[PDB]
Amino acid sequence: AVKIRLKRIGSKKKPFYRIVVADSRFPRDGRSIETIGTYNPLLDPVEVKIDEEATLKWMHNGAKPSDTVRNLLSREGIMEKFHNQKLG
Amino acid sequence: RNQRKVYTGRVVSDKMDKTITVVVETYKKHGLYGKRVKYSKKFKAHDENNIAKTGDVVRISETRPLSATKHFRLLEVVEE
Amino acid sequence: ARYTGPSWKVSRRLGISLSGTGKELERRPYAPGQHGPTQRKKISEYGLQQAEKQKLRHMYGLTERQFKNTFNKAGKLRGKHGENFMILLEQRLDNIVYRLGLARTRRAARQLVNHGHITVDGKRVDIPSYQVSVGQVISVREKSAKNSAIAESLEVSSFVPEYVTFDAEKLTGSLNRLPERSELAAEINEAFIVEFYSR
Amino acid sequence: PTINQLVRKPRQSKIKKSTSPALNKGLNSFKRELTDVNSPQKRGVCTRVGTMTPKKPNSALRKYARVRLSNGIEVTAYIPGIGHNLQEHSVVLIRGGRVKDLPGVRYHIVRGALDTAGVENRGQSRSKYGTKKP
RNA sequence: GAGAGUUUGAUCCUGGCUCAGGACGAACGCUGGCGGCGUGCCUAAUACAUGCAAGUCGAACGAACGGAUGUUAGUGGCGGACGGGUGAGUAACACGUGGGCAACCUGCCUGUAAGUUGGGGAUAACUCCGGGAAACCGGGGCUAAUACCGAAUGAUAAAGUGUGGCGCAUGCCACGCUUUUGAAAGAUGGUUUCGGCUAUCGCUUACAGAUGGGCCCGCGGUGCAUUAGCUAGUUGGUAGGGUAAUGGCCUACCAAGGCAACGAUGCAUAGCCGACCUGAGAGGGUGAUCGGCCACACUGGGACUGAGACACGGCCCAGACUCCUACGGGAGGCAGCAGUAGGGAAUCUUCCGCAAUGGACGAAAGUCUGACGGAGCAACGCCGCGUGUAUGAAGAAGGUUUUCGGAUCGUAAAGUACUGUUGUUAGAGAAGAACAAGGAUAAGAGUAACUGCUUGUCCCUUGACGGUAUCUAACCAGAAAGCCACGGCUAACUACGUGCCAGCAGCCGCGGUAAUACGUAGGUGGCAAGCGUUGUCCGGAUUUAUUGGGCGUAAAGCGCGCGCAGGCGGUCUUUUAAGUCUGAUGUGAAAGCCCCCGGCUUAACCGGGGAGGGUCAUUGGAAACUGGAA
Ligand SMILES: [K+]
Ligand SMILES: [Mg+2]
Ligand SMILES: [Mg+2]
Ligand SMILES: [Mg+2]
Ligand SMILES: [Mg+2]
Ligand SMILES: [Mg+2]
Ligand SMILES: [Mg+2]
Ligand SMILES: [Mg+2]
Ligand SMILES: [Mg+2]
């Protein structure tokens, strides 16, 4: 499959995550197709940056998210957005 | 459309059947000591009718493979 | 501290008062050891430049690896290399402690900030190697305020520089503005150092 | 030279020789063929032990051992320091270093690594000659 | 863009040798306190003791177990081709960069348009029989399906075609008619009236896309000519078959070409790159860790299965090697994670957990994952912190030395005051956690409507690390410093002992009875939880000189000519645009170097953003110079 998921980066006991487009097959920190955001769970508000237009695009092409990437999208208001574009 | 590669050169032989060999001859810069070197490189051109001859200036263009060696085609005969 | 040895012989070896003001040197300025009063020798280019380095890094009391990393880091800054290095070397926290004068010398300042008897920006910092910059306060932990070493070491203050402020009612001070090689003490050349590291 | 000369043949630098050729060769019993591998130290078995008369200007006797290394090369190794433990069929560890007094020696014996027992009675430079601290 | 020492009686040049810096996957010697981040078989792609690394679905199927849920050994589906390992081979479209495919494929993912109609025959499991210790094998009989095989209706699949618009020759795109083929399946759930209808998970056909692959091509990157010829399906063509697809890919027939001093062929070497180290830069060396691509899974070959393999933990066969046996016959491939032996100067625990991130299966709960998170060991490296702080004298005892007066170790100690980074003791105790599923509900599209689906908001929920970091108090200077050198090069000198002996040494060189060069003590210098030696790489080395050298005498002009090839080429006009120069577009991944911000008590480290980098390619311009032409 083609998936939207998390790329683990940073250091030990202090993770950071890039939000990435990739195949199911490729490795966790291997290659990708395009990276479109970042994530950090450490902070009291988790800090998310997403482009959202490429993200809508990859979803329209059928790149599905993970669970946590889905809920990041929904708490950013992007899954409502994508449903709204599926309405027509 | 997307476009293909085209080159110009000179003919060296005619013994082959419905084809020729076009030698391209370009100056280019020696990697370290900076001088210009005569780089040459011959290709096999697909001659649909055995038109061209030896001593002929010619233009070719690439295409699907047509033999073990050919990948090009005669496009024009610029100057005999 | 990092250097746990005696103090006076270094100043003697270097021909400059470091870790004091004539304390070590005004009696027998000559070099320590079997030799120094009996004879002296003429000292070479290498030795002079080296001795300049020594006068910096034993004035501040830090390892040579750390010292050279500080050199190379200061090398980035736009300006005169050794001036930038001297002012950053002053911009270390130990300096600011000793200039505020809650302790009588660099090594005591290091011990203070090692046990974390001070707090930058309100927060704790237990390292002598912190870098202060313009506007950062510093305090005495609100808990190490009455202790006799500080209470007796604040009785002395040779002169407060013009790039620091201090309120002893609070025991709170701060760096004002970065010096430029005239606010400081100026018993050094800042060029033989860069020679010695450039060869 | 002319540039055309330099194109017809580019330059060719010098072929560097090593101070320590025999450290820079490994062996595998299988292939029975030496394999170039940069190595700092090698262990060996003392074939012979003896003394040497060195060059002019000097005259003191110099202790050496003819060793067969792990890789099969036979090598003369100086035995630095006062007195030693070594004799025939003694195992020894070997570092590089050239005895300028002595013609056929190019390497030293690390003292204190193996059956080369440390020097007696030494107090200074102990890390060399391999005496513990007392 | 730093130089220093060393040839001589001395000098200048030439020329070599060494040194001062930086870096290591390092080893070794002496010593050794801690924390954070990292790194750790480079050698025998040598051999493997053992354990675990690929399973899953009961909402596909039948049987058995069971007091309706649940479980299973089997048939079936998907995945096993990912992830993980190593660098053997490989000098080539293998890799990088940039294009091309009108000459090509693509399960799972998304969307669009249609359709899941009716039947058949078996086969495991099971039960028996015989064999065999037993597994496990056969032979008979019974049996279910989302397993298999038929049909009707449906091809933007073929064949016959005709029209429109076109490209780059082979040709492409769109439309329509005729003829000939090609499909399927159910499961769960609700509702309804019982026929029906119907959500989701699946199935079949076509189309698009995305993603993943495949073929071709330009150029680029290694030494040897003490290796000059090589090739014979080899080169082209006409027919034919073959692949997902072009093509001597293969076959038959015809011709005899083709490549190559612009280094072919052959030998040895090597995975390639991003990038790493060094350097003023050009360049030199490397291809550990991280990412990409390639290749290979004891060696060799071959296929089947499948969307995808000629398959690490599949098959067959040959070969080597090994293991168990009841001696009849069976089984196997650690370059998966640990680990063992061996080799070696040398490199880790036979650890915990799927909490996280990601993958396989599943409707999902969940299961699986030596991927991955973590923890362990090694001072292997980078950073950080200590091993006390202050005060305290003409200056204790002692050591060294004494020019026997003193000088020095030395404010060091003692003594006094103070602190608790660390250590210890007792207490507290975060992040990381998002969710998923389930329970509620609010809106949608779609429904006869329900179920369901999608989305919004709440509730609930689960931590290996780990009672780890972190934080509070109490107690104690208490338990926490060693290595190298001291003639010059190069920082730092005395005493004794020895007597060309013992011994030192990177170069020069020391030691033959007054040794700052050996050994020791004191003192000093440089570093410091590391220091030094060895090995390797760059520089310095303009010592391979493109930048950037030279040949009268120092090394260096063939003994001289005739001359093929090549290199280089007088003055002017026109023409071009091969080279050159130039504007635009596209790309040169992330990480790394560089710059700017932020976060870890700073640092190391980590994040964000930008920049750079190509003899890069296409397209469009100039004609001064080189080149081509008249
Ligand atoms: K062929
Ligand atoms: Mg190899
Ligand atoms: Mg250079
Ligand atoms: Mg397999
Ligand atoms: Mg295996
Ligand atoms: Mg292993
Ligand atoms: Mg003597
Ligand atoms: Mg001569
Ligand atoms: Mg990049």
Side-chain angles (χ1 to χ4, degrees):
Chain A
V2 172
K3 286 180 174 181
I4 296 177
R5 63 179 186 172
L6 293 176
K7 181 171 174 175
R8 175 65 179 269
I9 203 161
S11 67
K12 183 173 77 171
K13 298 291 173 70
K14 180 72 173 181
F16 185 86
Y17 289 113
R18 292 169 77 80
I19 292 163
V20 184
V21 176
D23 288 335
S24 64
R25 286 181 288 174
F26 300 156
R28 193 271 304 283
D29 293 328
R31 70 192 185 99
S32 65
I33 301 155
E34 180 175 0
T35 187
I36 53 176
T38 62
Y39 172 60
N40 190 0
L42 276 305
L43 296 170
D44 194 3
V46 298
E47 294 293 332
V48 174
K49 291 181 186 169
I50 296 171
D51 182 66
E52 178 172 359
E53 60 92 19
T55 312
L56 285 174
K57 185 182 283 192
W58 287 105
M59 287 188 288
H60 289 301
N61 287 317
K64 292 184 181 173
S66 65
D67 288 331
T68 58
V69 171
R70 187 262 176 192
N71 70 25
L72 293 170
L73 290 169
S74 73
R75 287 191 285 103
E76 292 288 329
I78 297 164
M79 298 300 294
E80 174 178 358
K81 180 63 67 62
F82 179 65
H83 176 72
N84 290 122
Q85 291 294 313
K86 294 292 101 177
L87 292 177
Chain B
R1 292 179 76 192
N2 292 329
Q3 184 58 253
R4 291 184 187 272
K5 301 288 179 178
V6 68
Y7 294 102
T8 301
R10 295 179 182 276
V11 178
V12 176
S13 59
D14 296 328
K15 299 290 182 71
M16 287 69 75
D17 290 326
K18 294 187 288 294
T19 183
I20 50 171
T21 184
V22 171
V23 69
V24 178
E25 292 175 351
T26 62
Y27 290 183
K28 64 181 291 187
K29 186 178 179 183
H30 185 282
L32 177 52
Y33 303 119
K35 181 175 170 64
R36 291 185 292 167
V37 184
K38 280 183 183 178
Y39 182 70
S40 70
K41 182 65 178 295
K42 58 176 74 177
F43 296 114
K44 301 295 197 294
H46 184 61
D47 190 358
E48 193 186 0
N49 292 314
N50 279 319
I51 306 157
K53 293 180 176 179
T54 309
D56 191 355
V57 179
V58 68
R59 187 179 298 116
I60 60 172
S61 175
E62 69 89 17
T63 188
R64 66 184 175 89
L66 310 177
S67 70
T69 65
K70 288 181 184 175
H71 306 291
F72 291 173
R73 176 175 67 79
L74 170 53
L75 191 65
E76 289 293 325
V77 171
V78 178
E79 286 178 351
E80 294 177 353
Chain C
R2 185 80 276 286
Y3 181 77
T4 56
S7 175
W8 296 15
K9 62 168 70 182
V10 183
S11 298
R12 290 175 64 197
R13 179 71 270 182
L14 297 166
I16 291 296
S17 172
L18 53 80
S19 71
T21 59
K23 181 178 179 68
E24 313 90 358
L25 196 73
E26 294 173 351
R27 185 175 295 173
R28 52 176 179 179
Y30 57 85
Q34 184 180 0
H35 303 91
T38 59
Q39 188 59 255
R40 58 95 171 173
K41 296 177 173 66
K42 62 176 184 181
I43 296 166
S44 297
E45 184 67 24
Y46 184 82
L48 291 166
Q49 296 171 357
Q50 174 173 357
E52 192 68 25
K53 183 175 82 74
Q54 299 294 319
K55 286 189 288 185
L56 281 75
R57 69 171 283 268
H58 284 87
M59 180 165 72
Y60 291 94
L62 63 160
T63 308
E64 190 272 332
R65 184 70 185 174
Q66 195 185 6
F67 182 77
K68 188 179 283 182
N69 289 328
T70 307
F71 185 82
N72 288 321
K73 289 175 182 175
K76 182 171 180 177
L77 298 174
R78 295 176 64 186
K80 290 183 182 177
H81 204 290
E83 284 190 351
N84 293 117
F85 173 59
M86 185 67 204
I87 61 182
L88 181 65
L89 184 57
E90 291 281 321
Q91 191 175 357
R92 291 175 80 264
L93 184 67
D94 294 334
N95 196 20
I96 303 297
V97 172
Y98 174 64
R99 298 294 184 181
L100 266 63
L102 298 178
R104 290 180 177 85
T105 185
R106 306 284 191 182
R107 298 175 66 186
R110 285 180 68 83
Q111 196 78 59
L112 190 72
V113 65
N114 281 315
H115 295 284
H117 298 291
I118 58 181
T119 62
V120 66
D121 197 74
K123 295 181 177 71
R124 184 178 182 185
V125 58
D126 299 333
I127 60 175
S129 177
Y130 183 81
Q131 282 66 230
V132 176
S133 176
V134 298
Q136 291 185 3
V137 303
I138 187 73
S139 301
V140 296
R141 201 177 72 170
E142 190 61 24
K143 185 181 286 188
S144 301
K146 62 179 73 182
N147 297 120
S148 298
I150 303 94
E152 192 185 1
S153 292
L154 183 59
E155 183 68 26
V156 177
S157 174
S158 295
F159 65 99
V160 65
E162 295 294 332
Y163 63 95
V164 298
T165 53
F166 182 68
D167 292 330
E169 292 181 353
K170 294 178 188 177
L171 291 163
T172 301
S174 69
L175 178 66
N176 290 316
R177 188 267 304 164
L178 294 171
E180 60 187 2
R181 184 59 181 88
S182 296
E183 295 81 2
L184 59 82
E187 68 278 23
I188 58 91
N189 192 2
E190 70 277 21
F192 295 153
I193 186 79
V194 58
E195 293 175 355
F196 182 76
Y197 283 176
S198 176
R199 66 183 60 238
Chain D
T2 68
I3 302 294
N4 192 12
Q5 278 178 344
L6 282 167
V7 172
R8 291 177 63 237
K9 64 187 285 192
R11 299 293 194 181
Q12 183 64 40
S13 176
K14 189 184 287 188
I15 297 167
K16 294 179 177 175
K17 62 174 70 179
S18 61
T19 61
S20 67
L23 299 180
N24 207 162
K25 293 181 174 70
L27 182 70
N28 51 2
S29 299
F30 298 157
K31 297 291 293 187
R32 298 180 179 181
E33 183 176 357
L34 295 165
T35 66
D36 191 358
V37 59
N38 294 319
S39 72
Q41 292 173 354
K42 299 278 95 168
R43 63 102 178 172
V45 171
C46 299
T47 66
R48 186 175 66 240
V49 190
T51 56
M52 294 295 284
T53 61
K55 287 182 180 175
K56 295 179 188 192
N58 295 322
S59 72
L61 300 174
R62 295 282 186 259
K63 277 72 170 172
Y64 77 98
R66 186 75 186 274
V67 181
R68 191 175 297 105
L69 300 181
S70 70
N71 64 358
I73 303 165
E74 299 190 358
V75 164
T76 311
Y78 185 64
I79 300 160
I82 289 162
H84 57 76
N85 193 5
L86 297 177
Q87 60 180 359
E88 193 177 356
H89 299 105
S90 181
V91 178
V92 61
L93 194 142
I94 288 156
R95 63 102 175 278
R98 190 269 300 274
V99 167
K100 180 73 178 172
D101 285 333
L102 202 152
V105 171
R106 294 177 73 183
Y107 298 140
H108 287 74
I109 287 165
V110 174
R111 183 68 68 90
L114 299 176
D115 193 78
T116 54
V119 63
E120 296 295 329
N121 294 320
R122 196 182 180 93
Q124 300 187 358
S125 300
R126 293 186 285 102
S127 57
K128 305 180 182 184
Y129 304 97
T131 60
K132 284 173 70 180
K133 188 170 181 181

